[PDB]
Symmetry: C3
């Protein structure tokens, strides 16, 4: 019957396509973005204090940056023939010392030598002090702090539009003692690591003890057709590895690096750091709509079809 | 009236959809890209000369790489109880020295000690020589130079297509003394930093003195349906942070890193570098069109609807 | 004739749009991904042995990481006035020594001095031992090994869906001696570098001797409408620079970095490493489909038009 058809013709276009879907909908997916991240704060580890240039492994301050929370340090690693402390590689003869396994110290030379007094392991060639990743080192519990400053600037090239999250209404006096809280200061770009993990929804102790990646997505669903001040950034913080993390193997994200030094000598040595950190990832996504000319007649024709 | 309808039926399809819009329009957004960037040149700073392995902080040579233009260097930073040179933290008693503020040197121990002769500041624990970011250090004015070599290779998997910006027509003799200028050599992949900032549209002195990110987009709007040599890369250089830069706080992009050394001793020390640089970002985007079979009948049906 | 039209109405919708194209097709392009890469293995170079913290230049273990295969090492590089070993810069007088060329050692001072006994080259200012990139250093032929562990976790936010490539069915005992082979273990996330280059389709010797980038794409074409275990990752390994590589200039991807040390002195020195490596790139792409409500009536209307 055409009686219901007459109503349903406008119940879908005007109700949803026009008023809700913004029937014009001139989009621009290609948004060019720039993110600058700066970590600030001071932490205590073992018996010393470290700053931004210490727990932040990548100094670029790009959208990807690791905040180290747990360290395993091995100092004065010189090269030579050395045994290992891995109890999973017990040998009593050289026969079970040839190349058939996956050593963690170095290439086996087919020699089972004593380690300290009675522990016999295959002799390896490489850095002598083998790292011990079976000791629960104290976590940098001061890592609820160290604020993060995120400067984001985006451009829509087709619309020529340009906007940054550092609006002129914010001064240095405000930024001196500014936090992030999306009920009273949605706009302040000074995040807190503890606040970030709280918004993610996990306790900070476990994440700092095991490591992970927390993605901070800045969505810009703007309304350029309306006033330009209505395009408001939206911050969403979500764990990324935690989906595949649960309780299976590889219970976190950890990496290994080293610092290389040299005596007044002909030989070098490195200090090895195995770091469990919280690698922050910054992602920028969004779109803008404009009234334009072309989609109006297209939508009119589409309504004519109905 | 059908008289105007007959004309308007083909005025929109043949005029725009067919001839201009390439009605077939078989697209492939998923283009796999590889960018290799190599900076070359030698610069003078203070009283010494540095090369590519010095001002280019990330040695990967990926699409993201910082060209350092200004340095603030603090040498022989040993750990201990030290004061700070920040005049914004004046104290006359220990009462205003407990933890309630945002120190830039280290964790305050609640002790206000003299700095040099009469300047009293809260005693901090950490690296002793505090950095001074209030001195206008000379800018590396030689940074108009240091050419950049960009090797870009892309593949369209659905179309199997493959192309790189290093065409076989270019030899080493040409690349020896080749610049970039999109009127006589659009194709030479040897950019100049001064040329890049000039095409961006800002004076190099201000950018090198404050820092920023300059995105270089390589657009490949190819015409695979036609001859394969007509797919020509287009280079567009645009500032990214400059949108949110203007004259507000945080007037540039700067980072901090350090180099760690160790004496014939039991103690370590680091040299801290606060760098204001021009971080070049390389982005690859584009699409390809093919005649194919499917869209032809779809467009024919769409024309039949009109 | 309507006789063939009646058949062709359903020959295109039911045959292709409905059964094959999954007419509902509720997509989600915005998939949030996290990739953690860990290289393991030990290699022999010159007369020493190196581990993960040595040939893997970026210790972040992100989607982009270089596996160094060939090194050119210059040790004890101190600053001063030094000549160069580049035979392409022969001079017999100071007149052809002013600034008009592209030096590889440093800024020319307009002085042509002897190099060793009879070779005269322009005197440069900078690091004294100039690197020699014209000697075929032995390739790390042990680079067929050093397995790679890739942990990938993805989330579809609109569908709330969440999945990682480290499924609970895999334990540590399996991962201890697990390889990657897409006929018997498609699911094991332990790739082999030799296996990766074999699947790419090039001999490993040439790639390790010249360098390149090998992209590993993990496609997730899931069927969330069906059981969630049917969404199976697909690994595709493809060379990226090899398209623009062929036999033209710049026959590979190489970079330069250095390690900085300091004596018990007032001067510093660096050891320079020119590295030809295989930079692995990890890309994540995919989409998911859901039955939903909206597209059903849209497809019904589209069929009504026919
Ligand atoms: N390339 C690889 N080849 C084989 N096993 C690997 C590889 N990378 C990681 N693994 C294994 O994955 C598991 C997770 O290790 P993870 O990276 O979380 O750190 P870990 O348990 O401290 O071990 P590791 O000492 O091996 O670094 C371990 O059982 C480890 O042996
Ligand atoms: N994590 C942070 N917490 C608080 N304030 C911050 C943070 N990061 C940056 N700021 C502030 O942002 C402003 C811009 O500083 P910027 O990074 O441009 O370098 P700067 O002015 O030399 O300062 P700084 O010595 O703090 O590095 C400063 O007022 C600084 O205090
Ligand atoms: N910024 C640049 N300006 C000029 N020529 C460059 C630049 N970058 C690379 N080239 C040239 O590109 C070619 C490829 O060099 P490539 O990077 O593959 O290493 P190479 O041949 O060992 O040379 P190099 O000693 O210059 O690093 C060389 O002829 C080199 O001179
Ligand atoms: C991290 O910073 C917070 C504040 O930003 C510290 O927490 C406060 O410390 C003061 C110290 O006197 C207490 O009075 C407050 O009750 C604490 N909580 C709050 C909400 O203010 C905290 O000590 C810092 N360090 C760590 C490890 O959390
Ligand atoms: C400067 O302008 C900005 C943008 O409007 C203000 O920031 C937000 O403004 C909205 C107004 O719709 C308020 O609801 C928010 O509470 C504001 N957030 C923050 C963090 O301020 C900002 O308040 C303005 N500054 C002023 C008025 O001093
Ligand atoms: C950067 O390189 C340019 C050339 O590539 C140098 O500029 C020229 O220097 C010569 C020196 O005799 C002058 O004769 C020219 O007039 C200069 N300009 C041009 C356009 O050739 C420049 O000196 C280098 N350094 C800096 C800091 O710009
Ligand atoms: C090698 O072929 C390339 C691709 O055509 C040439 O590069 C451009 O060719 C177009 C022809 O349409 C010219 O208009 C441009 O001026 C060329 N640019 C450059 C930088 O050369 C290139 O010229 C060819 N090399 C030759 C003929 O020696
Ligand atoms: C890389 O590892 C492979 C095995 O993963 C080594 O190849 C085997 O070495 C044993 C040594 O006794 C031989 O018996 C086998 O025939 C070799 N091949 C295979 C397929 O097992 C190889 O030696 C290692 N190193 C290099 C440089 O390839
Ligand atoms: C655990 O479940 C996974 C997911 O099904 C199994 O992995 C694959 O399962 C498919 C079943 O369709 C097999 O065809 C593949 O051969 C399996 N691949 C691998 C590497 O195992 C896995 O087998 C299961 N583990 C068990 C049953 O122990
Ligand atoms: C380094 O110094 C030690 C003594 O501290 C010495 O035994 C060793 O031989 C030196 N290394 C080299 C390469 O000479
Ligand atoms: C480092 O050397 C200095 C003397 O130059 C000495 O005072 C200091 O105690 C040494 N550090 C350690 C940890 O022994
Ligand atoms: C470094 O030590 C050498 C001797 O090994 C000396 O000639 C030189 O002057 C020292 N450098 C400085 C800056 O004193
Ligand atoms: Mg382990
Ligand atoms: Mg400051
Ligand atoms: Mg060369």
């Amino acid at each position: 019957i055409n009686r219901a058809v007459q109503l349903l013709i406008i119940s879908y276009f005007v109700g949803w396509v026009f008023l809700h879907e913004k029937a014009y909908q001139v989009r621009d997916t290609a948004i060019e973005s720039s993110v600058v991240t700066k970590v600030k704060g001071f932490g205590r580890y073992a018996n010393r204090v470290m700053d931004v240039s210490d727990y932040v492994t990548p100094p670029q301050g790009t959208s990807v940056f690791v905040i180290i929370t747990k360290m395993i340090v091995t100092e004065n690693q010189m090269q030579g023939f050395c045994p290992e402390s891995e109890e999973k590689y017990r040998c009593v003869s050289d026969s079970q010392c040839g190349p058939q396994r996956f050593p963690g110290g170095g290439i086996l030379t087919g020699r089972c030598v004593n380690y300290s007094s009675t522990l016999r392991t295959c002799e390896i060639q490489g850095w002598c002090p083998t790292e011990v990743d079976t000791v629960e080192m104290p976590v940098m519990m001061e890592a609820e702090n160290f604020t993060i400053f995120i400067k984001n600037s985006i451009r829509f090239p087709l619309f020529n539009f340009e906007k940054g999250n550092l609006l002129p209404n914010l001064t240095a006096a405000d930024m001196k003692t500014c936090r992030f809280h999306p009920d009273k200061a949605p706009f302040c770009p000074i995040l807190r690591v503890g606040d970030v993990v709280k918004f993610a929804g996990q306790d900070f102790a476990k994440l700092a003890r095991t490591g992970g990646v927390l993605g901070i997505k800045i969505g810009w669903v703007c309304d350029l057709d309306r006033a330009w001040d209505q395009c408001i950034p939206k911050y969403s913080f979500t764990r990324l590895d935690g989906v595949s993390e649960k309780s299976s193997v590889s219970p976190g994200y950890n990496f290994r690096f080293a610092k290389y030094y040299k005596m007044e000598n002909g030989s070098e040595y490195r200090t090895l750091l195995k770091a469990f950190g919280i690698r922050f990832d910054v992602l920028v996504y969004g779109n803008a709509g404009k009234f334009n000319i072309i989609p109006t007649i297209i939508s009119s024709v589409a309504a004519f079809t109905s």
